[PDB]
Amino acid sequence: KRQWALEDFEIGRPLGKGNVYLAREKNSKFILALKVLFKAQLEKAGVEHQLRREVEIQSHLRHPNILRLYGYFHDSTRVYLILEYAPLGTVYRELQKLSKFDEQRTATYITELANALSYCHSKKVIHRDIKPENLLLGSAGELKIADFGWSVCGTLDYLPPEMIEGRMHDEKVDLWSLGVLCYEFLVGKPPFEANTYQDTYKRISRVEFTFPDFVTEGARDLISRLLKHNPSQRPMLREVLEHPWITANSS
Numbered sequence: 001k002r003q004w005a006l007e008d009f010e011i012g013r014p015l016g017k018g019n020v021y022l023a024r025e026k027n028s029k030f031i032l033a034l035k036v037l038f039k040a041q042l043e044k045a046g047v048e049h050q051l052r053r054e055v056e057i058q059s060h061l062r063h064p065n066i067l068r069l070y071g072y073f074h075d076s077t078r079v080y081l082i083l084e085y086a087p088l089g090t091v092y093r094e095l096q097k098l099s100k101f102d103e104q105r106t107a108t109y110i111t112e113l114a115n116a117l118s119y120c121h122s123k124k125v126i127h128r129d130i131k132p133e134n135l136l137l138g139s140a141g142e143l144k145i146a147d148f149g150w151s152v153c154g155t156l157d158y159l160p161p162e163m164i165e166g167r168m169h170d171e172k173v174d175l176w177s178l179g180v181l182c183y184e185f186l187v188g189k190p191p192f193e194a195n196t197y198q199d200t201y202k203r204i205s206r207v208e209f210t211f212p213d214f215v216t217e218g219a220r221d222l223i224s225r226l227l228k229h230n231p232s233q234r235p236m237l238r239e240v241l242e243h244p245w246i247t248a249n250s251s
């Protein structure tokens with residue numbers, strides 16, 4: 001499995017913050033991403049078990065639309081995660097430049113994500129934290145799931161009424177997330193977005209959303225199908241991949 005230390009990698013530009021830095025393995029010249037987690041931070045938050053879960057889950061996941069976790073290592077105060085480098089950055093950054101995506105680009109990201117989520121659910125692994133900042137873009141502009149920190153409570157967006165209400169939940173949480181993600185992709189903002197945490201809770205709880213005029217009948221239908229209060233009423237990933245709007249606009 002290879003034994004690693006800090007003295008094996010040349011650190012560079014910070015790629016993101018939660019931090020993750022650009023790194024080069026000195027011997028192989030291998031470009032990767034180093035997520036640097038402080039032990040004292042994980043101690044004062046009691047999330048050490050949650051990190052182990054993420055490490056165990058992502059290291060055994062193998063799919064072209066899932067970012068690879070090559071390995072881990074720790075020192076006296078820090079914990080390091082050797083992650084795959086996504087050359088084209090986050091989906092969040094992309095959406096900020098473009099404002100919103102077209103039906104073609106949206107349906108392709110949805111397909112790529114639904115496929116990756118189906119691979120995850122077949123292994124009984126539920127993502128729970130699907131959002132643009134946790135999604136990356138590979139060398140070919142393919143969508144890739146990066147963060148797996150909540151795999152098996154800041155912004156409520158993307159979380160279904162089950163999780164926010166503390167009730168038990170299925171793989172269906174990721175289907176709701178898919179619906180939130182499809183809307184955000186086409187509109188430019190998530191469907192339950194509010195100024196306060198308290199208002200976002202109400203928007204989610206009572207499923208309040210309205211489509212702007214430009215959102216098409218086909219896109220409206222899939223989003224409506226995915227944003228159901230009852231998780232049993234949510235369509236399966238196979239139903240989404242074979243949805244008319246998806247197949248008509250997907251690559």
Ligand SMILES: N#Cc1cccc(Cn2cc(NC(=O)c3n[nH]c4cc(-c5cn[nH]c5)ccc34)cn2)c1
Nearest residue numbers: 015016020033083084085086087088089090146147
């Ligand atoms: N300035 C600038 C700029 C503008 C455009 C493109 C790029 C290239 N770019 C590549 C990345 N890649 C990553 O950020 C990245 N690559 N691999 C990652 C893994 C995680 C990660 C954190 N937890 N789990 C995974 C998080 C982030 C990453 C970001 N920008 C940089």
